[PDB]
């Protein structure tokens with residue numbers, strides 16, 4: 001536990017988890033369910049908010065930056081895999097803007 005990690009849990013994840021655009025990101029991408037047989041060929045490090053949330057709850061992270069990289073990986077995977085005009089890109093951008101806004105007011109170590 002750190003000051004920064006508590007902030008990431010109580011402020012950042014709390015905000016993103018309940019957001020109306022959060023639902024595609026709350027569990028790992030299921031390539032079979034979604035019919036995306038190339039997903040794991042293009043995206044080599046899958047990440048999602050359920051995984052990040054569980055990690056925060058279970059004190060997985062050693063530094064706040066590690067959690068921040070997981071958030072970043074989740075959004076970046078979405079931008080890399082999807083078509084520029086797909087709605088999910090707009091949903092990712094909306095959540096990430098909130099991520100960055102909140103991270104601007106995170107404690108220093």
Ligand SMILES: CC(=O)N1c2ccc(-c3ccc(CN4CCCCC4)cc3)cc2[C@H](Nc2ccccc2)C[C@@H]1C
Nearest residue numbers: 023024025028029030034036039077078081082087088
């Ligand atoms: C996160 C991500 O990159 N993706 C992802 C990851 C997960 C899901 C996803 C997650 C859950 C469900 C099941 N939902 C149950 C509740 C009601 C809506 C369907 C369906 C798709 C979708 C998506 C995206 N598809 C999509 C389609 C229409 C609107 C928004 C997004 C493509 C893409 C592979």
